[PDB]
């Protein structure tokens, strides 16, 4: 029920989404990973963030491959995630108020031409000029994790979900280990 295909990595800045894997079990976050994920503000499990697939980030993505998974979400998934989940960490001081007010986008940016959430969605989906500015303003979305229950049915569901990781997620640990790319649309349809 799964297919694989070896594809040569290009140099174009493709849109990618990163989801925290929270593993391996026995590995303690090394200093290298501690800094790499800290710079990407992926310091919490289930955290999601949008990045640019530049050649300067490929080695970091390969290094943090065990700790996270990557993929190419569609425009619909990005729009749904942005309009259903959001964070605004600014004076309101550390208040986590969410994008319920388009006027806030006008106030914070104003001159960048981003006046509504749809503008941010379009900029992210089309690698807009304000991608760097909006993404920092668009603090990472706290995606809901898996079943998140300890019980009769919940434990059984968790076991089945875990068993699929071996058939879907694997790492060779070699320098030539290709980066694993999976359809983020299905994962979002499962997480969300």
């Amino acid at each position: 029920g799964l297919i694989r295909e070896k594809t040569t990595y290009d140099g174009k800045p493709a849109l990618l989404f990163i989801v925290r894997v929270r593993g391996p079990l026995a590995v303690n976050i090394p200093n290298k990973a501690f800094k790499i994920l800290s710079l990407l503000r992926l310091v919490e499990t289930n955290t999601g963030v949008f990045v640019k697939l530049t050649k300067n980030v490929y080695p970091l993505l390969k290094v943090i491959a065990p700790y996270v998974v990557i993929g190419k979400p569609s425009l619909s998934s990005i729009r749904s995630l942005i309009q259903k989940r959001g964070r605004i960490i600014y004076k309101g001081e550390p208040h986590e108020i969410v994008l319920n007010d388009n006027n806030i986008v006008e106030e914070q940016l104003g001159d960048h031409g981003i006046i509504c959430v749809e503008d941010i969605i379009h900029e992210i989906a089309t690698m807009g000029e304000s991608f760097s500015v909006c993404n920092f303003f668009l603090q990472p979305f706290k995606l809901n994790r898996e079943v998140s229950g300890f019980g009769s049915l919940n434990r059984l569901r968790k076991i089945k979900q875990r068993e699929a990781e071996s058939r879907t997620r694997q790492f060779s640990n070699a320098a030539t280990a290709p980066v694993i790319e999976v359809d983020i649309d299905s994962l979002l349809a499962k997480l969300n």
Partner: protein, 411 residues
């Protein structure tokens, strides 16, 4: 016969206390209230409180004895016990350590269906439409909420799919009659066979989930409404000659993921269903295309989404602070034009909603007695005083509105 005790006949046995009802049913309050919600049972207040409550003055809640007795025969009660036994046996297997046994047990279980509850609760099809307002409201609210530890992702996905199917059916038949926009969200008042059903649609923005509310009741309500709406949609599609379930184009689902995604096929009667006939409207990035597109599609022709692969149109909808180019081939109209057009139903002039122009306010579519009173009785006097106070309070609605209008008119 011998003496009959006071608290043994009449209201004493006509209504059963909630605590006594739970004991008689031998069912937990959670399951009892789940069954009550499924059957749509409600408490009742007799004309005398102490008489019903065994002569005791307490804030007791009373329920009709006949309804509770009929409830006891529902198969859902046995299904609840079966589910409890299955859960206990599955916990036993999990504690034992034979996961395979738990999987085998899970593969055998089947969930109960509320089909027979709907039949008795709604004997005739029009009854379901006459009360589907709450179901539509709950489904539209849940479809926009984010999945959490309480509500599973599958439930929200199913609710969103049901809402999308309902919207597609409404658009295909052009049954929209009146619409309204408020702080709570946008309102839609369709006409399903003449029921003038109204359903609120909140804005597609993130919503905070406070811990104060209890989704457990909401989960059961949504579970019932899911089957209710599924049956209603199937009946409507069969009546309209449309295939069911309506398949969805994955290509459109990737791009827009909404109304146009569902390609419903088989196998116009009102001015509201004729507005913007043969017209094509362009929608900007700022406007809620999800809300605007459905209204235009139900009223008139198709809509060109601002989304692209990331003209022959006649009007363009934009809400930017300053118009960008204003090509001569596209008429620029504020989003308020569509709502006002639907409310009026006669294509209100577009020269009042140009970009940057002030929008008009939006309106929802929906002496001798002094002495003569001496002869009035005490009860009649009190009733007249209450009526006079009710008239005076209603007069304030006009007085304080006219005063505020006068104050505003200064500038």
């Amino acid at each position: 016969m011998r003496i009959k005790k006071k608290n043994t006949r009449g209201n004493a046995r006509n209504f059963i206390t909630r605590s006594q009802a739970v004991r008689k049913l031998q069912v937990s309050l959670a399951d009892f209230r789940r069954l009550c919600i499924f059957k749509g049972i409600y408490p009742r207040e007799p004309r005398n409180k102490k008489k019903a409550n065994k002569g005791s003055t307490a804030p007791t809640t009373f329920y009709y004895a006949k309804d509770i007795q009929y409830l006891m025969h529902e198969p859902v009660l046995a299904k609840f016990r079966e589910h409890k036994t299955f859960a206990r046996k599955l916990t036993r297997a999990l504690g034992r350590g034979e996961v395979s046994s738990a999987k085998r047990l899970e593969e055998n279980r089947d969930s109960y269906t509320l089909d027979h509850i709907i039949k008795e609760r709604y004997p005739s099809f029009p009854d379901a439409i006459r009360d589907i307002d709450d179901a539509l409201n709950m489904l539209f609210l849940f479809s926009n909420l984010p999945s959490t530890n309480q509500v599973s992702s599958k439930i929200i996905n199913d609710a969103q799919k049901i809402c999308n199917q309902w919207l597609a059916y409404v658009a295909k038949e052009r049954l929209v009659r009146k619409v309204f926009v408020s702080i709570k969200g946008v309102y839609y008042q369709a006409n399903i066979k003449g029921e003038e059903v109204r359903w609120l649609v909140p804005f597609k923005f993130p919503e905070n989930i406070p811990s104060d509310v209890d989704f457990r009741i909401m989960l059961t309500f949504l579970e019932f409404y899911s089957t209710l709406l599924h049956f209603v949609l199937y009946k409507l599609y069969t009546d309209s000659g449309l295939i069911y379930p309506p398949k969805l184009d994955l290509k459109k689902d990737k791009i827009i993921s909404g109304l146009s995604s569902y390609i419903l096929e088989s196998r116009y009667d009102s001015p509201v269903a004729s507005l913007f006939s043969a017209f094509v409207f362009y929608v900007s990035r700022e406007v809620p295309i999800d809300i605007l597109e459905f209204l235009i599609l139900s009223c008139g022709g198709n809509v060109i989404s601002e989304a692209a692969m990331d003209s022959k149109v006649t009007h363009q909808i934009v809400d930017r602070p300053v118009l960008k180019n204003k090509v001569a081939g596209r008429t620029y109209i504020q989003p308020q034009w569509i709502f006002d057009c639907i409310n009026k139903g006669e294509l209100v002039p577009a020269n009042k909603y140009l970009p940057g122009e002030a929008l008009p306010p939006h309106l929802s579519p929906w002496e001798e007695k002094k002495l003569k009173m001496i002869m009035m009785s005490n009860k009649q006097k009190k009733l007249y005083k209450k009526m006079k106070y009710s008239n005076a309070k209603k007069e304030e609605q006009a007085e304080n509105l006219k005063k505020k209008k006068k104050q505003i008119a200064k500038q």
